[PDB]
Scaffold this motif. Structure first.
Motif: not given
Ligand SMILES: Nc1ncnc2c1ncn2[C@@H]1O[C@H](COP(=O)(O)OP(=O)(O)NP(=O)(O)O)[C@@H](O)[C@H]1O
Ligand SMILES: Nc1ncnc2c1ncn2[C@@H]1O[C@H](COP(=O)(O)OP(=O)(O)NP(=O)(O)O)[C@@H](O)[C@H]1O
Ligand SMILES: Nc1ncnc2c1ncn2[C@@H]1O[C@H](COP(=O)(O)OP(=O)(O)NP(=O)(O)O)[C@@H](O)[C@H]1O
Ligand SMILES: Nc1ncnc2c1ncn2[C@@H]1O[C@H](COP(=O)(O)OP(=O)(O)NP(=O)(O)O)[C@@H](O)[C@H]1O
Ligand SMILES: Nc1ncnc2c1ncn2[C@@H]1O[C@H](COP(=O)(O)OP(=O)(O)NP(=O)(O)O)[C@@H](O)[C@H]1O
Ligand SMILES: [Mg+2]
Ligand SMILES: [Mg+2]
Ligand SMILES: [Mg+2]
Ligand SMILES: [Mg+2]
Ligand SMILES: [Mg+2]
Lengths: 362, 362, 362, 362, 362
Positions: B1-5, B12-24
């Motif tokens: 599940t984790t979270a969103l960052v 710029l909008v930089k978004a991805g999932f918490a726990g990833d090492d880079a924005p998606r």
């Protein structure tokens, strides 16, 4: 002939002739220089800098009671005598003022210039707080003198100052100004310019007040109420200010808001008294004199009494003296002192100085 | 599940999932609407607006770190979740970021929307600079975080931020962009359109660099040399750029070029450190962390060191940290923080919010 | 097994095991708490408080030899045993020290805590000056014991203390520290913070010295000379100090500089001797033992001799004993005393205490 | 083997072995006990009490020839034998001395103790004055024996004492000591302590002398002259003494100065002779023997002759015998007497005593 | 015309006109001089020094009945005549008082000044104790006169003083004051200043009392009870005092508490009587007159009786006379004596003095 009295402090220059009951020239200690390229006079002082404020970069030669930019300082003195008072310096002895505990060299160089640049026949430097007490007409009391650059406590008893209990903080009018420049951005009012710093100064003077009960003042402030005030900028933009009206002056009592580890004025004054002999203390409590323009805040005396009576003994009567025209207290004292016949031997004569050398002023 | 960052900044909008090492999802915070009559979808976002840039009027909902056009802001968030990340908002808690000293109401309304429009179960708003430090993996250092909309200095020592010395300028990537749009007309390249503003953005990123010795860089520039570079426009038109390659980024150090009275970054950072306790200063000097996309300019770190070492004491070692991927620093920090087990109690729960009300986020 | 010796004074905590020739743990009696908002452990002790000094507000639980903040006092003891010495308190009897003429209740509560908080099986409280004499290895002499919080004179003759001539002043190391914080501002060095107080402490210890001939030392000082010394602050700022190097320690001899009506050490010691029987006086003069860290000032013994020989009779031989490691004198004495076989019956046993009650320690 | 001779008088204990020409142990009859709290041996005797005089309260077990504090008396005897003479009491018979007209019980208990505490095999108590005459080597003469506690006149003619004309005064060395302690305060020398009493004793012995013509000695004294002498105290304080040098010893001749109604020595001795048969008188006049330490005053014999020749008939030759070592006269006599073969039957044997009981010594 | 009576003692100056039943001027024998730098009159006397006590360093020209600082002494006399009594010295003969056994020169110089500085036509110096007896209206009794500087016993029988039994101690009011300054620190009340010494004087006079049964008074004191009293300082600080209320005055009876080897008053008075003739003793016992301000302590007479009756014979009736206004006894006696017609020939006439010279006053 008489003499000249010049309260050359930070923020404002208050000058006039000894024997007068009010300054003749009151203007900002500001030097302004064309920010923009220009050339499509690069030296404006006081009211000039004010009138042309939106072009010039405004600088204060004095900071925290210390003359930093001596060239600009001299510049202001030049105007003080030649353009403001319209006086040929050399015809008069000059009374200068200084905040206690200033860097020794500050006074040294200051007086040097009076003798060398302006050919002032004689001069004397007095501690501002002392003059303030003298202005009110007392020999006993503790002076809370707080202005643009410094805040200090000087305890004097029957004409005898008590050096070892003099307190001095950097909290001051200018710090308060900047604190507003910060917290106004909570609403979004980016008062970030120097011109705007000056605008904010005006905001202080018209809208700020001292909360009596800060905690419930905040609780009150949380509800929409009379606290909210409007303010007109130079460009017609209306500013709405609320909490900030008292959160700003509150920093004098809770310095940590700004970032100072020192105690608030309440305790600072209290401690000054604690360091004085017990036989004296009682009279200091009943003669707490406030002076300097930061004490122009609404209800600052009342709040002061509230907290200092909390700090002191329950059997100790405390009276705070708020002699109206607090803002000009020091200058007034200077006028009186200079007119005093038994003060004439206190003048340092140029001849005397030339023989003795700089050190004589200390 | 984790979270969103979601580093929902300006530009710029930089978004991805918490726990990833880079924005998606990395895309522009831009909303585009058909400039011309048309009708011979009137809402394009990010990459859409980019691909159709020559028709649309491109707007930035956020300016100087402040959400101005809330409708367009919401629009972008909508795409962020539903089209970019492909996530059903309500299944995840969301970490948002904010530039220090923003208008209080900015955060208030921002979080309101997350709870009401997107039904986000829980959220937290972190200061961007703090996350940046956290990303690098330090507890001590001063963060120079400079992006599209704002530039700020946040000093942190062993986990303790020092609010009273936070600096903030409006100098930023977007200002630099516009400065080129101006000075390119010296050669005659009328980059006056919004589409062209974006073209110029590309020009910055590929050709601009920071002069080490601006004065002699100009002297060098006066002679025909390697400085001159060509650039290919979308229509095949070749642009020749020389002096401008470094005159533009130099404005970060000499703000007056644009028209700001404030000090350049060199002195801004310096002053921030000056306002911190002497016992701290040394460590701030040896841990000067730069982050944010404007720090992607070539040699900006080297120039920074040059001047700050000039400003500081000769016995003071200064080290500037330029952790590669500076451009994504904040987002990275967010990912880390959100994954942190001891951060879970920091989430503001919708229930909690509903009880407490807006103010809770401050 | 042996025992523990804990010279829990003001300023420094000097602890170790009885039988050792030196303390094992020497650290500041300081408790530090995060001055700034923080949270972007709120209890640091001794070396911790030192290392994080620029964040924390540093407090001294003990002032003028009196334990004021008992919670912080306990905190330090906790560290002393568990983190510093690494000892399970209850396995050892503890020797504590105290400055003569302290508030009776100070000792009462102190020992209470040792029995109740730390379960110390037995303890003894000794007068610091007595131990100091004992450390040097003498039964006869007058002890000038002067440290961070108090200065006192205890005259002992062949093992018999003479209570009625014990002198005690509040002049001390900490007062001297603050005096520098004041007079350094004559040059302009605003050492006003607590962190800076500690910096100034370091300044004392490295640059201050006792003038032999103060009047001509000042005359010498008036001329530019070797007197001027530089000092390196934590932030690399160089400080120039001259007159202050000896004007500060001179206050021990001319207390009025600070603001005390009492006599200087010269006359204080002299008077102590005057109050003793004539048949004793001679031996006190030839055995003037100095101890405590304020006696670490360069030439303080020499100056002392100068003036006390002026005060005494011309036929009276005076010898001042400056047993190196003066700074640890008391602790050393404690180690010796505790190891002494004929001292074992002097321990107050918890059982004994529980029966007798608090008063037993007096 | 021989025997022991112990002149256990007031002030000094003079002991040695019978057959020797001088005492082996001469020390003060003083017991000292720690005046001050102490304990930061509570029994010092003779030279011990002297060396530690400034701590101890010094007491004289004997006053006016009477043993008052028997415990302290025993204590001294203990030291006399075991520590001073280094003799096992029981191996020797002991000769004790006593001032005529003492309380009967004094001797009774004294001898009891010798038999019971010290197991002295045999003893004899002799009248001090008798021994004194015997020491000089005469069978005829009048003895003026004057020491620390008593002054007495014993007339002896060809081996026959004349009891009915024995005179006894309380004027003595100790009284003279105290008289100085009084009159020195005329100059301001507050010799009020017991330690100081002893100091004053030393002053007597070194500076006092007997005026030949007191009235003109005072007239002389009125003029600044050689009379003025300096004296060095233990603490280096110099004392100036003049009139007192002879005013003190003059009290022996004018007792009213102290407060005694009795006649001075001149007339006391005279009267003793008057009470003797006319046929004897002449020989008493030509054999006036002085002994005892108060007769060590300079010129006391000469003054004595002056006045007694005034009192006596003009045809009466008077010779005063001042046999040097007057101070030890009695002890010397004892040594002689004990060595005398025809004195051996005079010893009271313990067996004899045990049978007879106490009364035997009278 | 009459005359002036001036009881110029230590502590208080009690002056008025001969023939009056009370002093007209009662004020402290204190000279005060500005402790602090000042000058932001450097000679205050008596009530002036009191009113400005917290600035001035207060000195007592007289100590232990001896005039030490003659310049300050003269100063006080000057005020006594010119400002207090408002009298032109030379118009009146002056009666001065003195404590028995004072340094001869004290009186000599004192009277010299009266003749030379003040042109006093005639004068007489009387012993204080004698006047005290005379004031009560008795010819027989022993006077225990105890004030600020000295304590003494003078035995007088039917108009005849008995010099040889005059006792004198340095225990006095001032010593008692200082003893409190010491023992109050057991609770923690650091009354260390001179100003505070004076405050403590007030504490004595209002709270101290003499324990009847000290041992059980202490036992009582161990239990929380009515003994505990509050006291209001000049700065409103409340002081709690208990044991000290009687432990302080107890030192008059157990001098060792302070550090004196002498006997307490009980035995001192007793001994004085012992030195007087047996035929006199009885009347001295029945006429024990107490006077002087230290006898103002509550129950001091009762305690005195208790112990002196223990010391005396069981068949000896003892009556202690506590004639109210004991504090002014001597002055009263002086007034009476001076008015006495048969005292007029006792005046030393300036002419007479000029002929005779200094010595005449003895
Ligand atoms: N009417 C006012 N109301 C509130 N605050 C004021 C008012 N007037 C002045 N102060 C503010 O506080 C300062 C007062 O100036 P002033 O007392 O003259 O200081 P100063 O004596 O000239 N400088 P110094 O004594 O050297 O610190 C300025 O910063 C003002 O903005
Ligand atoms: N590769 C690059 N080289 C030089 N400059 C860049 C580069 N990338 C970005 N910048 C420029 O500087 C800005 C960087 O964007 P960015 O750091 O993401 O700001 P932001 O964090 O999103 N906005 P904010 O923190 O709210 O001010 C943009 O205007 C870019 O044009
Ligand atoms: N090397 C030094 N040189 C000069 N002064 C020193 C030196 N070391 C210590 N002192 C100073 O004087 C004090 C000495 O500390 P210290 O003797 O341990 O006092 P303490 O015994 O621990 N406290 P106390 O006896 O309760 O007053 C501190 O304030 C030091 O700054
Ligand atoms: N050298 C001296 N000069 C003057 N006086 C002395 C001298 N020596 C002793 N006397 C004093 O007079 C006393 C002499 O002591 P001393 O003759 O031994 O008396 P005593 O025989 O021991 N006692 P007693 O016979 O019991 O009264 C002491 O008080 C001495 O101070
Ligand atoms: N009301 C009082 N209660 C208790 N003690 C008092 C009182 N009044 C005075 N004494 C104290 O004892 C002293 C009395 O003063 P006072 O009897 O006048 O001495 P004096 O005669 O002036 N000096 P002197 O005779 O030279 O020793 C002062 O120290 C007072 O503090
Ligand atoms: Mg001012
Ligand atoms: Mg950013
Ligand atoms: Mg110590
Ligand atoms: Mg003898
Ligand atoms: Mg008196």
């Amino acid at each position: 002939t008489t003499a000249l009295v010049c309260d050359n402090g930070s923020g404002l220059v208050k000058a006039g002739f000894a024997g007068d009951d009010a300054p003749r020239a009151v203007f900002p200690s500001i030097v302004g220089r064309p920010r923009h390229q220009g050339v499509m006079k690069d030296s404006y002082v006081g009211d000039e800098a004010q009138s042309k404020r939106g072009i010039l970069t405004l600088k204060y030669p004095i900071e925290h009671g210390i003359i930093t930019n001596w060239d600009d300082m001299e510049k202001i003195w030049h105007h003080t005598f030649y353009n403001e008072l319209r006086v040929a310096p050399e015809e008069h002895p000059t009374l200068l003022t200084e905040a206690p505990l200033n860097p020794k060299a500050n006074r040294e160089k200051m007086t040097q210039i009076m003798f060398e640049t302006f050919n002032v026949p004689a001069m004397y430097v007095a501690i501002q707080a002392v003059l303030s007490l003298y202005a009110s007409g007392r020999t006993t009391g503790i002076v809370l003198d707080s202005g643009d650059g410094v805040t200090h406590n000087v305890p004097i008893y029957e004409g005898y100052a008590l050096p070892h209990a003099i307190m001095r903080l950097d909290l001051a009018g200018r710090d308060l100004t900047d604190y507003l420049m910060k917290i106004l951005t909570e609403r979004g009012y980016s008062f970030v310019t120097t011109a705007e710093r000056e605008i904010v100064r005006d905001i202080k003077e018209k809208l700020c007040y001292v909360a009596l009960d800060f905690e419930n003042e905040m609780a009150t402030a949380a509800s929409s109420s009379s606290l909210e005030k409007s303010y007109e900028l130079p460009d017609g933009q209306v500013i709405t200010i609320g909490n900030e009206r008292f959160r700003c002056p509150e920093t004098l009592f809770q310095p940590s808001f700004i970032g100072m580890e020192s105690a608030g004025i309440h305790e600072t004054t209290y401690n000054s008294i604690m360091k004085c002999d017990i036989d004296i203390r009682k009279d200091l409590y009943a003669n707490n004199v406030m002076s300097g323009g930061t004490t122009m805040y609404p209800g600052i005396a009342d709040r002061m009494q509230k907290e200092i009576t909390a700090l002191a003994p329950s059997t100790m009567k405390i009276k705070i003296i708020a002699p109206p025209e607090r803002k000009y207290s020091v200058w007034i004292g200077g006028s009186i002192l200079a007119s005093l016949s038994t003060f004439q031997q206190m003048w340092i004569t140029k001849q005397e100085y030339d023989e003795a050398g700089p050190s004589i002023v200390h």
